[PDB]
Design a binder for this molecule. Structure first.
Ligand SMILES: *[C@@H]1O[C@H](CO)[C@@H](O[C@@H]2O[C@H](CO)[C@@H](O[C@@H]3O[C@H](CO[C@H]4O[C@H](CO[C@H]5O[C@H](CO)[C@@H](O)[C@H](O)[C@@H]5O)[C@@H](O)[C@H](O[C@H]5O[C@H](CO)[C@@H](O)[C@H](O)[C@@H]5O)[C@@H]4O)[C@@H](O)[C@H](O)[C@@H]3O)[C@H](O)[C@H]2NC(C)=O)[C@H](O)[C@H]1NC(C)=O
Ligand SMILES: *[C@@H]1O[C@H](CO)[C@@H](O[C@@H]2O[C@H](CO)[C@@H](O)[C@H](O)[C@H]2NC(C)=O)[C@H](O)[C@H]1NC(C)=O
Ligand SMILES: *[C@@H]1O[C@H](CO)[C@@H](O)[C@H](O)[C@H]1NC(C)=O
Ligand SMILES: *[C@@H]1O[C@H](CO)[C@@H](O)[C@H](O)[C@H]1NC(C)=O
Ligand SMILES: *[C@@H]1O[C@H](CO)[C@@H](O)[C@H](O)[C@H]1NC(C)=O
Ligand SMILES: *[C@@H]1O[C@H](CO)[C@@H](O)[C@H](O)[C@H]1NC(C)=O
Ligand SMILES: *[C@@H]1O[C@H](CO)[C@@H](O)[C@H](O)[C@H]1NC(C)=O
Lengths: 219, 219
């Protein structure tokens, strides 16, 4: 269903599009008679940049025969930010345009990044808080298969809407790892995929939530 | 770069694939995913290719070229009739789309195949209906004669719009249509400052056929 690869990173979101019908080369930028434009956001909230200015801001465009990759700084204007109860998620609606005389090629993708979700843990459960945003959670995938809502409870997943969206996981589902940051171990999940009904489509985010200590150690 | 061919009942747009290879052998292409738009802004009439084909549009493609035939009765064409002279414009956007990628071919044609053409002893005279185009250049072949040189080169403007050409600028030929000879021009390009842009029409204006004198024969 999805062909581009979206990766949320610390300071950066990477979009990689395959060249299904385009024949663009790395040379075809910063050259006469052709131009790249980066748009982030929707409608009047959409922020438009010529590639030159975007490069100055820390964007990077990479092209080879197989794919077109755009690295987007997480503070790019047009990103929509959702903070609630110290939990943080943001969305990136990208349109990347190559234009020549009488022709345009447009790569489109809408990313959900949620590295700073608030994660609380007690004796029996891990609890994620997901800020309210246009996405409605419809599936949770630990790796093997995509668990729909009507099967969450049986598989140890419990949703609570008393405030915002709290997603609970039985401690039995959690992995353990040693840690020197939250001494001397912490529970966590690896490559948890959350899928949302987001503005009429299915869109996922991948996260590695870990329980947090009140005061962690760091030098 | 695109080729626009205006006929009475049909306008042909042929686009090169300079930076794409859409419809190459490793791809399967269908009428699905194609959209035809004719007109500007909210006057643009949008058809899926399936419906446009019903109406008499025709799309033919290979990896090197994309050709769209647009019926002259297409919804969205702007029609200009004045003083028995007829000119019309076709603002085309042709889109091929996948879920995350699209290519858009754009061209704005000015067609005047049925422009009214009158000729007398000394001049050919074209009548151009009033429309958003301001005539700025006339190109017979080699170079684009701007307004400030028209009079010197035998071109005189008269006011919707009458454009006079001294007969010295005209070619002559016999034809099965005009067995003696006729004055004419081939691939005359008129260039207009059109809504902040440059737009041209190419036309083949012809005088009525010349009349030969009777020859007496055997008696
Ligand atoms: C076939 O059709 C022709 C047009 O459809 C028609 O030509 C017109 O005929 C009338 C009546 O005979 C003439 O009327 C006379 O006009 C002059 C005006 O002087 C000049 O006008 C034009 C262009 O003027 C341009 O001037 C500035 C720069 O100076 C430009 O920016 C701008 O383009 C203006 O339009 C010019 O062509 C004239 O040319 C002269 O020289 C030739 C040489 O043989 C002559 O043939 C021509 O008749 C004229 O003498 C001239 O420089 C005015 O002073 C008079 O009092 C009179 O009113 C039009 O000028 C003439 N127009 C053109 C473009 O030729 C033909 O008459 C018609 N033929 C028949 C048989 O019906
Ligand atoms: C650990 O936290 C979870 C959720 O954050 C608590 O689970 C809920 O507890 C309330 C009562 O406090 C019940 O009404 C809900 O049905 C529980 N939901 C789930 C999914 O278990 C749990 O009680 C907390 N445990 C402790 C010891 O505080
Ligand atoms: C996005 O912008 C378009 C205008 O380009 C508007 O019609 C649409 O309602 C916007 N979507 C949202 C969710 O605001
Ligand atoms: C935005 O992020 C870039 C790196 O992605 C960084 O260099 C820059 O200082 C940041 N600007 C602000 C205002 O945070
Ligand atoms: C086109 O579709 C056919 C099925 O009708 C499939 O067998 C073939 O592999 C496709 N061609 C290419 C080049 O992918
Ligand atoms: C063409 O449409 C755009 C909106 O797509 C509008 O802003 C503009 O005014 C229109 N131009 C003309 C000449 O009507
Ligand atoms: C429009 O013109 C095309 C030919 O260019 C023809 O096939 C079609 O029937 C015409 N439509 C109408 C409504 O006359």
């Amino acid at each position: 269903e999805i062909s581009e690869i979206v990766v949320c990173r610390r300071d950066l979101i990477s979009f990689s599009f395959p060249q299904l019908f385009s024949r663009l080369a790395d040379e075809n930028q910063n050259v006469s008679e052709m131009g790249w434009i980066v748009k982030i956001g929707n409608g009047t909230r959409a922020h438009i940049l010529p590639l030159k200015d975007a490069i100055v801001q820390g964007f990077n465009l990479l092209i080879d025969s197989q794919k077109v990759t755009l690295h987007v700084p997480a503070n790019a204007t047009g990103i929509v930010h959702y903070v609630q109860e110290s939990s943080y998620l943001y969305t990136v609606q990208l349109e990347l345009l190559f234009s020549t005389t009488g022709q345009k090629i447009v790569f489109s993708s809408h990313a959900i990044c949620a590295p700073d979700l608030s994660v609380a843990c007690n004796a029996t459960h891990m609890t994620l808080t997901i800020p309210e945003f246009p996405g409605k959670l419809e599936s949770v995938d630990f790796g093997q298969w995509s668990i729909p809502e009507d099967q969450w409870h049986a598989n140890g997943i419990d949703k609570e809407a008393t405030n915002g969206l709290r997603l609970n996981f039985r401690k039995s589902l959690l992995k353990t790892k040693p840690s020197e940051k939250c001494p001397f171990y912490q529970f966590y999940l690896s490559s948890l995929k959350l899928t949302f009904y987001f503005q009429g489509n299915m869109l996922s985010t991948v996260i590695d939530p870990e329980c947090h200590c009140e005061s962690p150690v760091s030098l």
